[PDB]
Amino acid sequence: GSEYEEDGWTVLEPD
Amino acid sequence: GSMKFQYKEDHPFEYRKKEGEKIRKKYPDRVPVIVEKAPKARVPDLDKRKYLVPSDLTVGQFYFLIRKRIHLRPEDALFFFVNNTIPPTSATMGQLYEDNHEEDYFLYVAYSDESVYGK
């Protein structure tokens, strides 16, 4: 459920 | 094109195709999934729409990921729609993307507090 915004995205991890 | 999702109407197909092929050859173990609301459903709208989740991540995990982003009220339910079909919870986003991504290399998922179609 990890938040991560790169290059205009939302890379939601399994955490 | 389909006049259903707004992301297809706000961005040209050429930019969406090159965005999909760029994000695919860069992050192969993940899938691009555009999450948007249902037509006038009584549910808060999700300002963040571009979501890159891992392939082996299941739809059940995706329900928890998205419901946290929406800050949905505890009384309502959340139903996803892949081609107006409630996707199997026991499936993976990589198998859904492999079987439902449009010509722009994007999986479109719509959420709603009520089942429009599926079961």
Residue numbers in the entry:
A (entry chain B): 1 to 15
B (entry chain A): -1 to 117
Quote the authors verbatim.
We selected γ-aminobutyric acid type A receptor-associated (GABARAP) as the target, a protein responsible for mediating autophagy through its role in autophagosome biogenesis and recruitment of cargo, resulting in lysosomal degradation of damaged or surplus proteins and organelles. For designing macrocyclic binders against the human GABARAP, we used a similar pipeline for MCL1 and MDM2 but we doubled the number of generated designs and defined six hotspot residues (Lys46, Lys48, Tyr49, Leu50, Phe60 and Leu63) to guide the macrocycle backbone generation to a specific site on the target. Two designs, GAB_D8 and GAB_D23, showed binding affinities of 6 nM and 36 nM, respectively. To our knowledge, GAB_D8 is the most potent macrocyclic GABARAP binder to date. In crystallization trials, we did not obtain crystals of sufficiently high quality for GAB_D8 bound to GABARAP. We instead crystallized GAB_D8 bound to GABARAPL1, a homolog of GABARAP with 86% overall sequence identity and 100% sequence identity for residues within 5 Å of GAB_D8 in the design model. The X-ray crystal structure for GAB_D8 bound to GABARAPL1 matched very closely with the design model, with a Cα r.m.s.d. of 1.2 Å over the macrocycle when aligned by the target protein to the closest of the four copies in the asymmetric unit and a Cα r.m.s.d. of 0.47 Å when aligned by macrocycle alone. Notably, the X-ray structure of the GAB_D8–GABARAPL1 complex showed two different bound conformations of GAB_D8, one that closely matched the design model and a second one that partially deviated from the design model, with a register shift nucleated by Thr10 from the macrocycle forming main-chain-mediated and side-chain-mediated hydrogen bonds with Lys48 on the target. While our original design models were predicted with single sequences as inputs to AF2, we retrospectively predicted the GAB_D8–GABARAPL1 and GAB_D23–GABARAP complex structures with multiple-sequence alignment (MSA) inputs.
